[PDB]
Amino acid sequence: GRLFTSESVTEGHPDKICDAVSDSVLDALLAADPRSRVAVETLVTTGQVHVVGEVTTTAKEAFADITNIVRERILDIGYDSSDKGFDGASCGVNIGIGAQSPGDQGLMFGYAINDTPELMPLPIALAHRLSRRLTEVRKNGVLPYLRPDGKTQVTIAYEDRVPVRLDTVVISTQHADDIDLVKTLDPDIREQVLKTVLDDLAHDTLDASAVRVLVNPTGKFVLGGPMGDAGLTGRKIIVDTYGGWARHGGGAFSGKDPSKVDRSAAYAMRWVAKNVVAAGLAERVEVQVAYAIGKAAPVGLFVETFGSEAVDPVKIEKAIGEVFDLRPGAIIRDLNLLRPIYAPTAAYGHFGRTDVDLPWERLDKVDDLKRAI
Amino acid sequence: GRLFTSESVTEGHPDKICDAVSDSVLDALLAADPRSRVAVETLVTTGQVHVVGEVTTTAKEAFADITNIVRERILDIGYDSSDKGFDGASCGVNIGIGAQSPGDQGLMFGYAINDTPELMPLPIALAHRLSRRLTEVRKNGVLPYLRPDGKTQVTIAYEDRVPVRLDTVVISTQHADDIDLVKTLDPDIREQVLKTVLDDLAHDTLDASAVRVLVNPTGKFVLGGPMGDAGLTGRKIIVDTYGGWARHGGGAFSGKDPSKVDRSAAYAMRWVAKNVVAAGLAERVEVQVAYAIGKAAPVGLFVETFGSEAVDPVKIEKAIGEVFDLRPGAIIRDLNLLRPIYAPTAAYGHFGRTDVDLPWERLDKVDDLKRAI
Numbered sequence: 054g055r056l057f058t059s060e061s062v063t064e065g066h067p068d069k070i071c072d073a074v075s076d077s078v079l080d081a082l083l084a085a086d087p088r089s090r091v092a093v094e095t096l097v098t099t100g101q102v103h104v105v106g107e108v109t110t111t112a113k114e115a116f117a118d119i120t121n122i123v124r125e126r127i128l129d130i131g132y133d134s135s136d137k138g139f140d141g142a143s144c145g146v147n148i149g150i151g152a153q154s155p156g157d158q159g160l161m162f163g164y165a166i167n168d169t170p171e172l173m174p175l176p177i178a179l180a181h182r183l184s185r186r187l188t189e190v191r192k193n194g195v196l197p198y199l200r201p202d203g204k205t206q207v208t209i210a211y212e213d214r215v216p217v218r219l220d221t222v223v224i225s226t227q228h229a230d231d232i233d234l235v236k237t238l239d240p241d242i243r244e245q246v247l248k249t250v251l252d253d254l255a256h257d258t259l260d261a262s263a264v265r266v267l268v269n270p271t272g273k274f275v276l277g278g279p280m281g282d283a284g285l286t287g288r289k290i291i292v293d294t295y296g297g298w299a300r301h302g303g304g305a306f307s308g309k310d311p312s313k314v315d316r317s318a319a320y321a322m323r324w325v326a327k328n329v330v331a332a333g334l335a336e337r338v339e340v341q342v343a344y345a346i347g348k349a350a351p352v353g354l355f356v357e358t359f360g361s362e363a364v365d366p367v368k369i370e371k372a373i374g375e376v377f378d379l380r381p382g383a384i385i386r387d388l389n390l391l392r393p394i395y396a397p398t399a400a401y402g403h404f405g406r407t408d409v410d411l412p413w414e415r416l417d418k419v420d421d422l423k424r425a426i
Numbered sequence: 427g428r429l430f431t432s433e434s435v436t437e438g439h440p441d442k443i444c445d446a447v448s449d450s451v452l453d454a455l456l457a458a459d460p461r462s463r464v465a466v467e468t469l470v471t472t473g474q475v476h477v478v479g480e481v482t483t484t485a486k487e488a489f490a491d492i493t494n495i496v497r498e499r500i501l502d503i504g505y506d507s508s509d510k511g512f513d514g515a516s517c518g519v520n521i522g523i524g525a526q527s528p529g530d531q532g533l534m535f536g537y538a539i540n541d542t543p544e545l546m547p548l549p550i551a552l553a554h555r556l557s558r559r560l561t562e563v564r565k566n567g568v569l570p571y572l573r574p575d576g577k578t579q580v581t582i583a584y585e586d587r588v589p590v591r592l593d594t595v596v597i598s599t600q601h602a603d604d605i606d607l608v609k610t611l612d613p614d615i616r617e618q619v620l621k622t623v624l625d626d627l628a629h630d631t632l633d634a635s636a637v638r639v640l641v642n643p644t645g646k647f648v649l650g651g652p653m654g655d656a657g658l659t660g661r662k663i664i665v666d667t668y669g670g671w672a673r674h675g676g677g678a679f680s681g682k683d684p685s686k687v688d689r690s691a692a693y694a695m696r697w698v699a700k701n702v703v704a705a706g707l708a709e710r711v712e713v714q715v716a717y718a719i720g721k722a723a724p725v726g727l728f729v730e731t732f733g734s735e736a737v738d739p740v741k742i743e744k745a746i747g748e749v750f751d752l753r754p755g756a757i758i759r760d761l762n763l764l765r766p767i768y769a770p771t772a773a774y775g776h777f778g779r780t781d782v783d784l785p786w787e788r789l790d791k792v793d794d795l796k797r798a799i
């Protein structure tokens with residue numbers, strides 16, 4: 054018997070607003086100048102956004118427009134009124150970004166596991182499915198009374214590595230003041246969010262019949278986002294990745310262009326791990342890549358299969374080194390990373406996404422691995 | 427045959443400046459009102475500090491003094507001139523903190539391992555020893571030409587879990603513009619920083635005779651800190667903990683009062699794991715604690731010993747449940763957390779410190795565990 058809990062948040066959570074604004078600036082610059090170098094951090098607090106950092110780009114028009122990119126992103130998230138705690142059209146926006154016209158000892162991790170169709174650990178996969186659906190029923194008008202800020206927590210009970218029970222689900226969501234928590238919110242969330250996600254997943258062993266469901270356990274949640282709070286870019290890196298189930302090297306993703314190895318190699322490592330698992334080489338795998346200063350190619354590639362391998366782990370390591378080219382330049386080319394694809398990654402997780410198609414989630418190396426093992 | 431790399435940074439690194447400022451504010455508030463509730467975030471970029479968030483406190487004088495607390499912390503770090511890229515006496519300081527007068531589904535981790543006297547993984551333990559000594563030789567006048575910003579990277583080679591070789595050390599440090607990199611910095615850092623740390627540690631198996639040493643491999647490093655950069659609180663959470671060696675639930679520490687379980691329970695988990703290893707019950711251990719909403723005491727406690735246990739892992743779990751009271755109220759009492767002890771934690775790691783005495787590092791439960799096993 055083990056319990057494992059992971060968490061996700063909606064795009065309206067103040068830290069996630071920051072990640073999305075940072076990545077929205079990044080996408081605007083890449084769309085006009087694919088070689089842009091970008092290190093952009095966002096802060097939010099009551100009624101203000103502060104965007105800072107450094108850019109090297111030829112995309113002068115997009116750079117000029119950053120103030121409008123900020124506002125439009127916030128509006129798209131759904132903050133369009135002080136009654137909601139925040140209004141993208143009228144909040145303060147301050148830009149302190151340095152602008153110009155035109156490496157590491159490292160140990161990066163990737164992970165995949167056959168507990169879900171998307172090959173992610175179940176607690177985080179379910180938490181992200183729930184937070185994404187919470188947003189979906191607001192935006193599609195099914196529960197139009199919802200507001201952007203929200204959080205999901207999923208606790209799974211395991212016996213001998215098998216997920217056997219959905220122990221607890223917590224869903225906190227912002228909403229209009231006049232909504233009855235017990236008569237309206239609780240059954241609507243159970244029906245439109247929890248039940249539809251569980252149906253979608255159709256898990257083979259997860260028994261959800263006795264789940265303890267807590268919807269807004271602390272009561273009314275009328276104001277949200279930056280209101281009476283603060284958020285920063287890169288403060289949800291466990292939410293962005295594997296929900297605590299896998300190890301983390303420490304780099305945040307959002308607001309960084311693909312030349313930042315923190316981002317692109319983390320994406321490659323997910324890609325490698327996912328294809329290893331999808332190929333049938335192991336039921337779960339953590340993949341490690343070792344980099345050296347002055348060398349482009351890795352100096353080490355190590356697999357941990359936690360006893361779950363179907364073949365010698367040393368053979369898996371050799372097959373990876375044969376199939377994948379993990380030089381940064383090769384990664385950037387092969388995953389086609391110099392494109393404005395990043396704003397969608399800034400909430401609901403960078404890995405295992407069921408609603409968007411990301412290059413590092415493609416199972417396009419399964420055949421190659423099978424031929425090389 | 428495995429490599430592992432971890433990194434540390436000095437108190438002058440821009441992310442760490444933010445953590446230090448956040449915890450300096452926290453300390454000032456706790457010194458006058460131990461019951462203060464604090465969620466304070468700090469951002470820095472070229473020439474400015476922006477401190478935001480929320481506070482509930484009776485410490486009105488301390489709150490009024492926040493602008494001076496900021497400046498004094500930055501001066502203490504060593505930024506006192508535009509020549510260094512930043513001056514605490516004359517930079518921009520903007521305070522946007524809400525102020526007034528007067529739980530979760532969770533799974534937190536702690537880790538310990540017998541690879542160092544401080545019972546921390548060797549790569550991060552050495553990286554922190556190095557970054558701390560780099561600061562020390564600047565402040566004590568031995569290498570007075572150094573400036574605050576700096577970074578260390580340590581790569582260790584392992585054979586069957588034994589640390590056998592110090593593979594690579596990178597030390598990057600800020601310094602005055604008139605310093606010769608080859609004639610001065612290179613041998614000074616090797617002699618005063620690397621050599622002294624390795625002599626201090628006197629490791630039993632780590633062979634350092636063939637170490638690749640890189641001092642400032644990208645050359646001159648004259649401006650630093652926030653200059654031409656940006657930092658935010660809570661962007662070094664892996665540096666703050668186990669250097670990527672252990673799993674992380676996701677919460678940052680700095681700028682949060684001890685009622686934040688993200689902070690206090692992480693500290694108690696380290697305390698638990700450290701006492702387990704010190705008691706000789708396992709050579710390495712990850713301890714996980716599961717909390718439920720509406721319940722003070724944990725609903726689960728799990729021990730992973732990675733095959734290194736001296737006794738049944740299950741007997742270790744039982745002894746922990748008997749010896750430790752992991753209710754947050756108990757943890758705050760027993761570790762005596764409502765005191766201004768946090769500013770020193772904000773750089774060089776929260777765990778495994780050789781230069782300061784922290785309550786969650788005391789081996790005061792080794793005897794208890796031995797009697798309960």
Ligand SMILES: [Ca+2]
Pocket residue numbers: 277278280281282
């Ligand atoms: Ca809030």
Ligand SMILES: [Ca+2]
Pocket residue numbers: 417418419420421
């Ligand atoms: Ca293929």
Ligand SMILES: [Ca+2]
Pocket residue numbers: 650651653654655
């Ligand atoms: Ca810098």
